[PDB]
Amino acid sequence: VKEVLEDFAEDGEKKIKLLTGKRVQLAEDLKKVREIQEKLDAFIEALHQEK
Amino acid sequence: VKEVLEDFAEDGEKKIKLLTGKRVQLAEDLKKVREIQEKLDAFIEALHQEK
């Protein structure tokens, strides 16, 4: 069983096609778009700084 | 009565003879605090872009 679990742990496809039920994926976008949010708002402050 | 109410118009004290004046002072404070923060928001956004 430990051997099987290790083999499945290394298998990325098995993780993709098993244990997929959590809602964390939705939250990953909420957190990742923070870089876009920084570049855009810093750019808008820059438009004001120039004008 | 119109004449007396004109005399009311002339005197502001005659409007706050009874000291329940929270209305006017609170309105003025709200507007001025919005000004204080608005001047500060432009000033703080300026410190972040340059210091």
Distances (CA, A) of A3 to A7, A10, A16, B43: 6, 11, 19, 62
| Cβ neighbours of residue B8 closer than 8 Å, sequence gap 6 or more | B14, B15
Number of H helices, E strands in chain A: 4, 0
**DSSP structural state of residue A11:** -
Can you tell me the distance from the alpha carbon of A12 to that of A27, in angstroms, rounded to the nearest whole number? Answer: 21
Q: Where do we find the tokens 């750019």?
A: A43
| Cβ neighbours of residue B16 closer than 8 Å, sequence gap 6 or more | B24
State how far Cα A39 lies from the chain centre: 18
Q: What is the largest CA-CA distance in chain B?
A: 62
State how far Cα A50 lies from the chain centre: 34
Tell which of B38, B43, B44, B45 to mutate to test the A interface (max A CBs under 10 Å): B45
| Cβ neighbours of residue B50 closer than 8 Å, sequence gap 6 or more | A49
Can you tell me the distance from the alpha carbon of A29 to that of A23, in angstroms, rounded to the nearest whole number? Answer: 11
**DSSP structural state of residue A22:** -
Taking the Cβ of residue B45 and every Cβ of chain A, the question of whether any pair is shorter than 8 Å is answered with yes
Minimal CA–CA distance to A44: which of B49, B8, B1, B22?
Answer: B49
